[PDB]
Design an enzyme around this catalytic site. Structure first.
Site, PDB file in Angstrom:
ATOM      1  N   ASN A   1      -6.364   5.263  13.892  1.00 39.59           N
ATOM      2  CA  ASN A   1      -6.118   4.109  15.399  1.00 39.59           C
ATOM      3  C   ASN A   1      -4.609   3.843  14.879  1.00 39.59           C
ATOM      4  OD1 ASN A   1      -9.195   3.272  14.759  1.00 39.59           O
ATOM      5  ND2 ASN A   1      -8.394   4.763  16.546  1.00 39.59           N
TER       6      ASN A   1
ATOM      7  N   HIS B   1      -3.936   1.280  12.456  1.00 41.73           N
ATOM      8  CA  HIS B   1      -4.651   0.023  11.826  1.00 41.73           C
ATOM      9  C   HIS B   1      -4.499   0.252  10.795  1.00 41.73           C
ATOM     10  CE1 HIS B   1      -5.006  -1.792  16.396  1.00 41.73           C
ATOM     11  NE2 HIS B   1      -5.131  -0.955  16.719  1.00 41.73           N
TER      12      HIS B   1
ATOM     13  N   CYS C   1      -2.966  -7.799   9.744  1.00 44.05           N
ATOM     14  CA  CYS C   1      -1.396  -7.588   9.554  1.00 44.05           C
ATOM     15  C   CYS C   1      -1.519  -6.307  10.361  1.00 44.05           C
ATOM     16  CB  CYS C   1      -1.836  -6.499   7.899  1.00 44.05           C
ATOM     17  SG  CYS C   1       0.414  -5.645   7.822  1.00 44.05           S
TER      18      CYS C   1
HETATM   19  C1  LIG Z   1       6.221   0.210   7.800  1.00 38.99           C
HETATM   20  C2  LIG Z   1       5.021   0.366   6.797  1.00 38.99           C
HETATM   21  N1  LIG Z   1       3.392   0.101   8.131  1.00 38.99           N
HETATM   22  C3  LIG Z   1       3.095   1.468   7.687  1.00 38.99           C
HETATM   23  C4  LIG Z   1       3.240   2.525   8.180  1.00 38.99           C
HETATM   24  C5  LIG Z   1       3.483  -1.177   8.213  1.00 38.99           C
HETATM   25  O1  LIG Z   1       4.260  -1.748   8.276  1.00 38.99           O
HETATM   26  C6  LIG Z   1       2.135  -0.999   9.297  1.00 38.99           C
HETATM   27  C7  LIG Z   1       1.805  -1.822   9.318  1.00 38.99           C
HETATM   28  C8  LIG Z   1       0.701  -2.430  10.639  1.00 38.99           C
HETATM   29  C9  LIG Z   1       0.446  -1.548  11.611  1.00 38.99           C
HETATM   30  N2  LIG Z   1      -0.597  -0.871  11.783  1.00 38.99           N
HETATM   31  C10 LIG Z   1       1.158  -0.221  10.989  1.00 38.99           C
HETATM   32  C11 LIG Z   1       2.320   0.193   9.834  1.00 38.99           C
END
Ligand SMILES: CCN(CC)C(=O)c1ccc(N)cc1
Ligand SMILES: CCN(CC)C(=O)c1ccc(N)cc1
Ligand SMILES: CCN(CC)C(=O)c1ccc(N)cc1
Ligand SMILES: CCN(CC)C(=O)c1ccc(N)cc1
Ligand SMILES: CCN(CC)C(=O)c1ccc(N)cc1
Ligand SMILES: CCN(CC)C(=O)c1ccc(N)cc1
Ligand SMILES: CCN(CC)C(=O)c1ccc(N)cc1
Ligand SMILES: CCN(CC)C(=O)c1ccc(N)cc1
Lengths: 269, 268
Positions: A190, A192, A227
């Site tokens: 998903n 997440h 996060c």
């Molecule tokens: C750019 C790095 N990155 C993970 C790919 C994210 O900041 C990220 C954090 C939460 C999330 N639900 C989706 C992505």
């Protein structure tokens, strides 16, 4: 894997893989947490619920309601070595209108001995507003025929660790790891962040000398906020204590918004 | 898992797990790379070599010599869905005194159809000095009785993608992801960064819109230097074109190269 004879629990065996082990050649606690999630997901599939980690009914899906983890508590007596076969049994129970609980028991497949146990608290939330809600009779009734009707607890003990309130770490932290950020491998289907990634982030601020001389016995982790896209996390740890105990806090690196709090108990090797 | 009838290759089946899949509910390329390493390790175990990822003999161990990956090349035709059973066959071959090669073939267990293939180049190195060494007759002879004597290639063709030289990306990169750093989950039993983590870092600088609209078909990755204790990595990507990209991983500080690679993507 399969549901057990009475159809109220699910069992599955796993062979510990080469990349799943740490420096002692035994499974890490993140490997254990991933297997707990896998057997939970296979249990949900076996009885017709969603297989996206939210274990929803058609009723919850039309209301945009999902189940989310509020707390994970794991106690390990022996980590399985590489190549070992571990058998995990899991079951769920309603806890009135507050939410649901999923419990697990880990055993060494060869000896039949209990090597670990775990429990988790889940709450119902609207997936869009992120607002929590009490469980209605209609939702409760859908799940009740898939759960034991008499209490069955992985942590039966009087005032056990899994139900204790966790305090908020106060600055300055004794130890820290700053600027932790997820990569695509940390995400689920998903998009997440996987619940197990937060366990890894908590552990990052434990000094390497503790990890090299101790074994993690117990971890309790509260999940307060996710996060989200582009978020960066700081992992904070302070010793509270042959046993060492720690208090943990994960917060956003910018404004300091809390995302998790937890405690760990370690035994000297 | 088990060695095959002739004892010169190894096969093992895996059921794709819930946490091993991406947005399409199919295994990620890092999950595939991890299964390739797992079956390689079970093959080494089945014939008495070390099971630490270095697949050494007692002879190499007394000389402090290890095998290390110089290049990984993977081509996927269909990623297995969650719950699917994938069968992987693997074998190895000496390539004279330069080094060794490990090949893999991935199949859908139900249909028997080939869904992917992979190959890798390995060199011998002293574990302490990090200096490369040509393979002596004594070491070569120890491995030869465990390998097919006639060539057996996952990528048989002369001048195929797995053997092409990769150029060095020149600044400015079109896309980048900076300050990437490993956590304990990225380490192996020897406290070294797992080879698959570098694949994940390369992919981090591919824009999310490409990942959402395309499927990764081919990845070729050179390993030039390890990411060591307290190192931080920048992932750089430039489009060279189906979409094709050129990749570079380098240390965040001084810009020392750690990996270079190329990826080829097909529109969904
Ligand atoms: C750019 C790095 N990155 C993970 C790919 C994210 O900041 C990220 C954090 C939460 C999330 N639900 C989706 C992505
Ligand atoms: C804890 C979330 N949840 C739904 C209540 C579940 O995982 C669940 C899965 C299978 C089952 N028979 C009953 C419950
Ligand atoms: C302190 C609030 N809280 C956790 C959010 C709870 O009382 C809680 C209890 C049982 C359960 N299944 C889920 C949640
Ligand atoms: C009384 C203990 N207890 C609920 C199990 C908690 O303090 C608790 C609060 C928030 C949370 N996300 C998880 C747990
Ligand atoms: C490429 C490294 N290497 C040793 C040469 C191996 O993995 C190896 C494992 C089993 C086997 N029968 C032969 C070789
Ligand atoms: C250009 C240098 N190089 C890779 C380091 C090689 O020629 C190489 C070829 C075959 C092999 N098994 C291992 C290495
Ligand atoms: C075309 C020759 N060749 C090896 C296949 C390479 O360019 C090569 C060089 C260094 C390295 N670590 C991996 C690969
Ligand atoms: C402090 C973060 N960390 C991973 C634990 C590292 O810098 C690390 C990098 C390479 C390595 N072989 C060992 C450790």
């Amino acid at each position: 894997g399969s549901l057990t004879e009475d159809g109220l629990s699910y069992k599955e065996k796993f062979v510990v893989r080469s990349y799943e082990v740490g420096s002692n050649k035994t499974a890490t606690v993140e490997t254990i947490a991933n297997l707990l999630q896998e057997v939970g997901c296979n249990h949900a599939q076996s009885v017709g619920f969603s297989t996206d980690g939210f274990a929803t009914t058609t009723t919850m899906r039309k209301l945009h309601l999902i189940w989310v983890t509020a707390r994970m508590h794991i106690e390990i007596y022996k980590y399985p070595a590489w190549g070992d076969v571990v058998e995990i049994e899991t079951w769920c129970q309603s806890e009135g209108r507050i939410g649901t609980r999923r419990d697990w028991i880990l055993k060494d497949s060869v000896t039949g001995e209990v090597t670990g146990r775990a429990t988790s608290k889940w709450v119902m939330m609207n997936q869009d507003t992120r607002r929590l809600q009490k469980v209605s009779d209609d939702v409760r009734d859908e799940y009740l025929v898939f759960c034991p009707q008499e209490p069955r607890l992985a942590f039966p003990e009087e005032n056990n660790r899994s139900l204790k309130k966790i305090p908020k770490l106060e600055d300055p932290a004794q130890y820290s790891m700053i600027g932790l950020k997820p990569r695509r491998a940390d995400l689920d289907m998903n998009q997440h962040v996987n619940n197990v990634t937060y366990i890894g982030w908590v552990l990052e601020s434990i000094p390497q000398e503790i990890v090299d001389t101790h074994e993690l016995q117990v971890i309790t982790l509260d999940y307060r906020r996710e996060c989200q896209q582009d978020d960066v996390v700081d992992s904070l740890t302070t010793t509270t204590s042959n046993d060492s105990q720690f208090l943990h806090l994960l917060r956003l690196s910018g404004d300091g918004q809390e995302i998790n709090r937890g405690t760990t108990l370690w035994r000297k090797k």
